Structures are given as structure tokens and as C-alpha cells.
Amino acid sequence: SVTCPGGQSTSNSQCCVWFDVLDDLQTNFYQGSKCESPVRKILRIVFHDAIGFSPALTAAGQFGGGGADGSIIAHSNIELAFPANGGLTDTIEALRAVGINHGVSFGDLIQFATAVGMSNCPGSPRLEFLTGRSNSSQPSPPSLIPGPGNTVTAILDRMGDAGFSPDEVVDLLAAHSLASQEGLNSAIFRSPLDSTPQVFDTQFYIETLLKGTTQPGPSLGFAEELSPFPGEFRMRSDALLARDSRTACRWQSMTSSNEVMGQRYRAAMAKMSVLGFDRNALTDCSDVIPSAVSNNAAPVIPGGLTVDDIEVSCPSEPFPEIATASGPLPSLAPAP
Numbered sequence: 001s002v003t004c005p006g007g008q009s010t011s012n013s014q015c016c017v018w019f020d021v022l023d024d025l026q027t028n029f030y031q032g033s034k035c036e037s038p039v040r041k042i043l044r045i046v047f048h049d050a051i052g053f054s055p056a057l058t059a060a061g062q063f064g065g066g067g068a069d070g071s072i073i074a075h076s077n078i079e080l081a082f083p084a085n086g087g088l089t090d091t092i093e094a095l096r097a098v099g100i101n102h103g104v105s106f107g108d109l110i111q112f113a114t115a116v117g118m119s120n121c122p123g124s125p126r127l128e129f130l131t132g133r134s135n136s137s138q139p140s141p142p143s144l145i146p147g148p149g150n151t152v153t154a155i156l157d158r159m160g161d162a163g164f165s166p167d168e169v170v171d172l173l174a175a176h177s178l179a180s181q182e183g184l185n186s187a188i189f190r191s192p193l194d195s196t197p198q199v200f201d202t203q204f205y206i207e208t209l210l211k212g213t214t215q216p217g218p219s220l221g222f223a224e225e226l227s228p229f230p231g232e233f234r235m236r237s238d239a240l241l242a243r244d245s246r247t248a249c250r251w252q253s254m255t256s257s258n259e260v261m262g263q264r265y266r267a268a269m270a271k272m273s274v275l276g277f278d279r280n281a282l283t284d285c286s287d288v289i290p291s292a293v294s295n296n297a298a299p300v301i302p303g304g305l306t307v308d309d310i311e312v313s314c315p316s317e318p319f320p321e322i323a324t325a326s327g328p329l330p331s332l333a334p335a336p
């Protein structure tokens with residue numbers, strides 16, 4: 001519908017400032033539209049910002065949190081002291097400056113930087129982007145972010161309170177396909193959670209299901225489990241969710257199709273992006289988001305392992321026929 005100063009067409013005039021913050025983020029924050037640590041840090045940030053939302057606290061007369069309100073930036077002084085928010089300060093400050101410089105709300109800016117960051121990573125779906133979240137927020141209550149040492153019952157209860165079913169919890173975890181850890185075992189800094197930390201694919205669901213065989217570092221870190229090969233890090237909650245009877249069949253269904261996985265993830269992220277808001281009050285500016293390059297590789301069981309190495313945990317469905325690869329066991333380099 002309208003033409004923005006740069007000659008681009010958009011549906012609403014409210015979308016025109018976003019082409020300018022698109023260029024800034026791609027050039028600066030993402031260092032030339034790359035899919036590296038700034039994208040992975042922003043994905044941790046959008047979850048940690050959005051999940052500080054609790055209907056139960058509200059119901060009990062307490063402030064339950066404003067959801068996707070950018071409070072992790074406006075109140076970084078209190079929220080970055082939370083256990084789950086370590087290693088985010090440098091990214092929060094960079095985002096703060098962009099927000100202030102373009103006059104956009106912090107909650108909107110985090111949703112936008114997630115959609116734009118994912119467009120730099122092959123295989124990603126185009127995420128919906130809505131604008132209009134108010135810039136005013138209050139600090140998130142503590143203890144609303146799931147931890148890697150939490151039991152599955154604990155994660156599903158916290159996630160369920162926020163509004164997600166067990167299925168959507170598994171769908172949301174597709175973001176660990178673009179992930180590493182820095183603070184759980186600092187000895188193997190940026191060890192990847194799957195073999196393709198720069199490709200949004202199904203490898204994370206396949207690989208967390210393989211039998212834990214290797215200790216990748218000198219010792220085990222917090223909430224660390226044995227992984228299937230050198231260089232890969234396996235987190236306890238991911239290992240447990242892969243195997244728990246409440247989430248095992250959805251986890252298994254996510255292994256053979258990158259198309260189904262992307263579809264499910266996009267839908268769960270659209271829900272997470274408006275926690276604390278009425279989406280009918282927001283303006284759709286999804287047309288600003290660029291397409292990612294396609295991922296043409298097929299799902300594989302890496303380095304000589306076969307179906308006999310995966311710990312099938314969904315009792316009702318047989319494991320999908322996934323291709324195997326020859327070669328020895330891969331050793332993963334740190335995520336860039």
C-alpha cells in the first residue's frame with residue numbers, strides 16, 4: 001500500500017521506520033547480515049523477555065509481568081541479575097542504543113531483531129512482525145524463566161502458566177538448532193547444541209535423541225549430559241524433554257521435515273511475541289522482513305551412527321527413515 005522514503009512499498013506508514021532500523025541492524029549489530037553469536041543472543045533475549053509473564057501471579061493479586069514488553073532492556077539493572085540472564089549485557093546495550101536512536105519501543109525492537117536475525121540463517125521461516133507494543137514496562141518478577149536443571153514437570157508447568165501446551169514447548173525449542181552455550185561449561189566456550197549452529201534445521205531433534213556417549217570438555221558443567229560426539233554440548237532439559245513421555249512423540253515428529261518444523265516454530269513464536277498484548281491492537285509489518293536463503297540439505301544421522309544409536313522414546317510411532325552418513329564421528333568446532 002504506501003511507499004516509504006526509500007521507495008519500498010509497505011502496507012502501513014507505521015512500517016516505514018522499520019526499514020531504517022533494518023539497515024542499521026544488518027550493517028552493525030549483525031556485522032553484514034551474518035548468522036553468528038548476535039542472532040543466537042537475540043533469540044535467548046526474546047524468550048527471556050517474553051516469558052516474564054505469569055497469569056498465576058496476576059490471579060494471586062501480584063504483578064505477573066508484562067510479557068513481550070522489552071523490560072529486559074528498560075529494566076536490565078534488575079533483570080540481568082537473574083540466573084538465566086547471564087552473558088547478555090553486551091547484546092542488551094547494543095539493542096538499547098538502536099532503540100533510542102530510532103525512537104522505537106524496546107518490546108517492538110526485540111521482536112524485530114529476532115525476525116531479522118533469523119532471516120540471516122539458512123533454512124529459517126519468515127517470522128511475523130507486529131509493531132505498536134507500548135514502551136512502558138515494569139520489571140519482570142524473578143523466577144519465571146525455565147532453567148536447564150529444571151525437571152520436565154517444572155518446565156511444562158511454567159510454560160503452561162504462560163500459555164503454552166507441551167507441543168508448543170517442543171516447537172519453541174527449535175531455536176536450539178541455532179545455539180551454543182557459553183556459561184554452562186566455560187571450558188568449551190560456544191560448544192554447539194547441534195552440528196549445524198548456523199542452519200535452522202531438524203539436526204537438534206535428531207542429535208539430542210542419540211545415546212549420550214562423549215564428555216566434550218575436561219569436566220561436566222552445570223546441567224551437562226554426555227553428548228553423541230566431540231564438540232557437541234548436551235543440556236539436561238533438552239535430553240529429558242526428548243525422552244519424557246509427555247513430549248517424546250512431538251520431539252520425534254520434528255526430526256524428518258524442516259518444512260513442518262519451521263511452520264510449527266513460526267506459529268509458536270507468533271504467540272510468544274504478543275504475550276502481555278492484544279495482537280488486534282498491533283499493526284502488521286511482516287512485509288518488512290526479508291526471506292532467508294533456503295536450506296537444501298536433508299536431515300541425517302551424522303558420522304556413521306544409525307537408528308540403533310537413537311534412543312527411541314515415542315512408543316506409538318516408529319522412528320522416521322532418516323538418511324545416515326558415512327565417515328567417522330564428527331568433532332564440532334565452536335559456533336561462530
Ligand code: HEM
Pocket residue numbers: 037039040041043044047087146147148155172173175176178179180181182183184235237335
Ligand atoms: C525449555 C526452556 C529452555 C531452556 C531450559 C533453555 C536453556 C538454555 C541455556 C541454559 C542455554 C545456554 C546459555 C549459555 O550458557 O550461553 C541456552 C541457549 C540458547 N537458547 Fe535456550 N532454553 C530454553 C528455551 C529456548 C527458547 C524457547 C528459545 C528461543 C525461541 C531459546 C533460544 C536459545 C538460543 C538461540 C541459545 C543459544 C545462545 C548462544 O549460542 O549464545 N531457548 N538455552
Ligand SMILES: *[C@@H]1O[C@H](CO)[C@@H](O[C@@H]2O[C@H](CO)[C@@H](O)[C@H](O)[C@H]2NC(C)=O)[C@H](O)[C@H]1NC(C)=O
Pocket residue numbers: 073074075096099100103104105106135136
Ligand atoms: C522507552 O523507554 C525508555 C525508558 O525506560 C527510554 O530510554 C531512555 O532514553 C533516554 C533518551 O531518550 C536515554 O538517555 C536513557 O538512557 C534511556 N533509558 C534506558 C533505561 O534505556 C526510551 O527512550 C523510550 N523510547 C521511546 C521511543 O519512547
Ligand SMILES: *[C@@H]1O[C@H](CO)[C@@H](O)[C@H](O)[C@@H]1O
Pocket residue numbers: 216230231330331332333334
Ligand atoms: C572436535 O574438534 C573440534 C575442532 O575441530 C574441537 O572443538 C572439539 O573439542 C573436538 O576436538
Ligand SMILES: [Ca+2]
Pocket residue numbers: 048049050051052066067068069070071072140
Ligand atoms: Ca518482559
Ligand SMILES: [Ca+2]
Pocket residue numbers: 176177178194195196197198199200201202203204
Ligand atoms: Ca542447526
